[PDB]
Amino acid sequence: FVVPDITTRKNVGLSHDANDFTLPQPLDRYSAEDHATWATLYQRQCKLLPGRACDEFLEGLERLEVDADRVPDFNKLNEKLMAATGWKIVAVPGLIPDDVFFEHLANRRFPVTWWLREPPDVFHNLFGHVPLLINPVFADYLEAYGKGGVKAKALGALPMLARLYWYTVEFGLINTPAGMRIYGAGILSSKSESIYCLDSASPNRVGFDLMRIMNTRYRIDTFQKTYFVIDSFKQLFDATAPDFAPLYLQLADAQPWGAGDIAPDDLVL
Ligand SMILES: [Co+2]
């Protein structure tokens, strides 16, 4: 049997723009159970993340006044985000087409799935992804990433950018004098990957390298086998400076690294 998935079920009776896929945040659809689920997830992550999340992340939660006890009102959050870096969040139904996603980031809009899991949802997207948007260097990286979507689409290279996004914005680590810390949203919203990625001898921790990353496969249904480590958000922004077109064409011919591979030139940590 095939039953409707959570995206389908949650969006019953709702609409979205056929071109940009946004909708007003449907506040009336959040039940008491939704707010309680949010509060439980927020409490869980805030207990586990000190000394694991990068300090900027935890500061962003506070500066944006991300609600601890209910699903946040996007408009209220936007008042703080806009004043900090000129970014805003927009509600979307769930996963959206790549060219739409890139167009949003290129215009300093961060798409956030509106609905919550039952006890890539609103907790993952808002709690995991949004706090670092108050950091001007990280925000500029996302904008530059977005702006690259047009060229990538024209060259059939969106999956090569998707690898960069996955291994930075979703699953990135940042080294600090106090020890390795986490900035990837997929880790920051996770119950246990937050532990494994810092504490386990199992995964590879490899120094950030743009070409290497864009040549690296990833898998979505398991903890990462490789994490890429930056020294600064400036390293991410600076990585977007050159022309990606000849990088894409070089990679198009190559065999990608597997998700668990170590490459000959890796700086291994
Ligand atoms: Co994500």
Side-chain angles (χ1 to χ4, degrees), residues 151-184:
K151 175 181 283 189
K153 186 172 185 173
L155 297 173
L158 290 168
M160 307 175 166
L161 279 186
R163 294 163 180 171
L164 177 61
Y165 193 88
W166 186 264
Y167 282 118
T168 59
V169 184
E170 299 283 2
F171 291 94
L173 302 181
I174 179 164
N175 211 355
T176 86
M180 190 72 76
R181 296 289 182 275
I182 299 159
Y183 78 97

XYZ file of all heavy atoms in Angstrom, residues 151-184:
266
model
N 24.171 29.746 -13.061
C 25.297 29.175 -13.801
C 25.327 27.651 -13.651
O 25.494 26.914 -14.634
C 26.613 29.797 -13.320
C 27.869 29.194 -13.933
C 29.141 29.833 -13.390
C 29.400 31.202 -14.003
N 30.738 31.735 -13.633
N 25.135 27.170 -12.428
C 25.136 25.729 -12.202
C 24.023 25.034 -12.971
O 24.258 23.994 -13.588
C 25.037 25.407 -10.721
N 22.814 25.582 -12.925
C 21.717 24.966 -13.670
C 22.016 24.916 -15.168
O 21.769 23.896 -15.826
C 20.384 25.673 -13.401
C 19.209 24.964 -14.056
C 17.866 25.530 -13.640
C 16.748 24.689 -14.243
N 15.413 25.097 -13.732
N 22.568 26.005 -15.704
C 22.877 26.096 -17.131
C 23.896 25.051 -17.578
O 23.921 24.655 -18.744
C 23.365 27.498 -17.475
N 24.724 24.604 -16.638
C 25.794 23.661 -16.916
C 25.522 22.235 -16.413
O 26.398 21.370 -16.501
C 27.105 24.201 -16.322
C 27.603 25.526 -16.911
C 28.805 26.055 -16.140
C 27.945 25.362 -18.385
N 24.322 21.985 -15.882
C 23.979 20.658 -15.353
C 24.773 20.303 -14.108
O 25.028 19.126 -13.824
N 25.144 21.332 -13.345
C 26.045 21.182 -12.217
C 25.379 21.400 -10.862
O 26.065 21.468 -9.850
C 27.238 22.120 -12.378
N 24.048 21.477 -10.820
C 23.378 21.640 -9.530
C 23.766 20.562 -8.509
O 23.938 20.887 -7.339
C 21.857 21.773 -9.668
C 21.365 23.083 -10.297
C 19.892 22.980 -10.656
C 21.605 24.271 -9.379
N 23.948 19.293 -8.943
C 24.359 18.305 -7.935
C 25.753 18.555 -7.372
O 26.036 18.169 -6.241
C 24.293 16.978 -8.698
C 23.259 17.216 -9.752
C 23.520 18.632 -10.193
N 26.605 19.239 -8.127
C 27.930 19.550 -7.621
C 27.832 20.643 -6.528
O 28.438 20.500 -5.459
C 28.889 19.844 -8.799
C 28.907 18.731 -9.884
S 29.946 19.320 -11.218
C 30.148 17.771 -12.072
N 26.998 21.669 -6.736
C 26.701 22.640 -5.665
C 25.998 22.002 -4.479
O 26.265 22.361 -3.331
C 25.871 23.818 -6.168
C 26.623 24.927 -6.886
C 25.681 26.075 -7.194
C 27.814 25.434 -6.079
N 25.102 21.059 -4.752
C 24.379 20.382 -3.678
C 25.353 19.699 -2.714
O 25.103 19.680 -1.506
C 23.379 19.374 -4.230
N 26.456 19.151 -3.234
C 27.481 18.534 -2.382
C 28.159 19.578 -1.492
O 28.385 19.338 -0.296
C 28.528 17.824 -3.227
C 27.983 16.633 -3.979
C 28.931 16.242 -5.085
N 28.425 15.081 -5.827
C 28.962 14.629 -6.952
N 30.030 15.223 -7.475
N 28.441 13.556 -7.537
N 28.451 20.746 -2.067
C 29.029 21.816 -1.263
C 28.093 22.225 -0.124
O 28.517 22.363 1.024
C 29.377 23.013 -2.148
C 29.929 24.257 -1.423
C 31.229 23.962 -0.685
C 30.118 25.376 -2.433
N 26.819 22.417 -0.445
C 25.822 22.775 0.555
C 25.720 21.707 1.643
O 25.722 22.008 2.844
C 24.465 22.975 -0.118
C 23.415 23.650 0.731
C 23.311 25.034 0.763
C 22.514 22.911 1.488
C 22.333 25.666 1.520
C 21.528 23.530 2.250
C 21.438 24.907 2.262
O 20.478 25.525 3.026
N 25.615 20.443 1.228
C 25.482 19.335 2.151
C 26.655 19.311 3.134
O 26.451 19.203 4.336
C 25.472 18.035 1.366
C 25.187 16.856 2.215
C 26.095 16.010 2.787
C 23.897 16.404 2.624
N 25.438 15.029 3.504
C 24.089 15.263 3.433
C 22.590 16.859 2.387
C 23.019 14.547 3.979
C 21.521 16.141 2.936
C 21.751 15.011 3.730
N 27.870 19.446 2.615
C 29.040 19.285 3.467
C 29.481 20.551 4.216
O 30.475 20.527 4.955
C 30.187 18.685 2.660
C 30.051 17.185 2.446
C 29.931 16.641 1.156
C 30.046 16.307 3.535
C 29.823 15.256 0.962
C 29.943 14.924 3.345
C 29.829 14.418 2.064
O 29.721 13.037 1.930
N 28.700 21.624 4.060
C 28.951 22.866 4.782
C 27.707 23.212 5.591
O 27.642 22.927 6.784
C 29.433 24.019 3.855
O 28.476 24.302 2.827
C 30.789 23.658 3.229
N 26.719 23.806 4.930
C 25.506 24.279 5.585
C 24.765 23.177 6.351
O 24.235 23.415 7.428
C 24.563 24.933 4.552
C 23.336 25.529 5.214
C 25.304 25.999 3.754
N 24.737 21.954 5.799
C 24.013 20.881 6.471
C 24.873 20.102 7.466
O 24.394 19.781 8.562
C 23.379 19.912 5.466
C 22.374 20.576 4.544
C 21.018 20.859 5.192
O 20.820 20.590 6.404
O 20.137 21.405 4.471
N 26.126 19.792 7.114
C 26.940 18.865 7.935
C 28.345 19.344 8.273
O 29.213 18.556 8.612
C 26.920 17.444 7.324
C 25.568 16.804 7.460
C 24.629 16.878 6.429
C 25.199 16.212 8.663
C 23.352 16.354 6.605
C 23.923 15.694 8.845
C 23.002 15.772 7.810
N 28.541 20.660 8.227
C 29.871 21.216 8.452
C 30.328 21.251 9.902
O 29.530 21.428 10.835
N 31.646 21.139 10.080
C 32.310 21.347 11.375
C 33.256 22.540 11.265
O 33.742 22.845 10.177
C 33.092 20.098 11.802
C 32.303 18.791 11.949
C 33.231 17.667 12.388
C 31.173 18.946 12.953
N 33.508 23.203 12.396
C 34.416 24.333 12.432
C 35.393 24.075 13.572
O 34.995 23.785 14.711
C 33.658 25.688 12.540
C 34.652 26.853 12.608
C 32.691 25.723 13.716
C 34.059 28.229 12.329
N 36.677 24.131 13.241
C 37.702 23.934 14.259
C 37.935 25.243 15.017
O 37.848 26.331 14.438
C 39.006 23.402 13.657
C 39.771 22.502 14.619
O 39.390 22.337 15.786
N 40.843 21.885 14.124
N 38.191 25.128 16.318
C 38.405 26.297 17.176
C 39.519 25.958 18.148
O 39.827 24.781 18.354
C 37.136 26.700 17.982
O 37.056 25.957 19.212
C 35.822 26.574 17.162
N 40.130 26.981 18.770
C 41.170 26.678 19.762
C 40.648 25.866 20.948
O 41.426 25.161 21.593
C 41.636 28.069 20.213
C 41.344 28.948 19.053
C 40.057 28.428 18.478
N 39.338 25.948 21.201
C 38.698 25.203 22.284
C 38.281 23.787 21.880
O 37.755 23.043 22.705
C 37.498 25.977 22.813
N 38.527 23.423 20.623
C 38.140 22.115 20.117
C 37.210 22.217 18.927
O 36.748 23.290 18.550
N 36.960 21.078 18.308
C 36.064 21.015 17.172
C 34.637 21.360 17.570
O 34.170 20.926 18.630
C 36.094 19.592 16.624
C 35.394 19.453 15.297
S 36.380 20.234 14.014
C 37.644 18.956 13.826
N 33.960 22.161 16.744
C 32.568 22.532 16.994
C 31.727 22.292 15.741
O 32.270 22.002 14.670
C 32.473 23.991 17.497
C 33.156 24.257 18.846
C 32.418 23.617 20.028
N 33.046 23.926 21.317
C 34.064 23.259 21.858
N 34.601 22.210 21.241
N 34.560 23.649 23.031
N 30.415 22.444 15.890
C 29.475 22.099 14.836
C 28.801 23.364 14.301
O 28.341 24.216 15.083
C 28.355 21.190 15.399
C 28.944 19.879 15.945
C 27.302 20.905 14.332
C 28.033 19.179 16.931
N 28.688 23.466 12.978
C 27.846 24.506 12.388
C 26.776 23.967 11.428
O 25.840 24.686 11.092
C 28.660 25.665 11.768
C 29.264 25.354 10.417
C 28.634 25.744 9.240
C 30.483 24.675 10.313
C 29.185 25.473 8.003
C 31.047 24.407 9.079
C 30.386 24.791 7.924
O 30.906 24.524 6.682
N 26.871 22.692 11.020
C 25.879 22.145 10.077
C 24.507 21.947 10.715
O 24.389 21.314 11.771
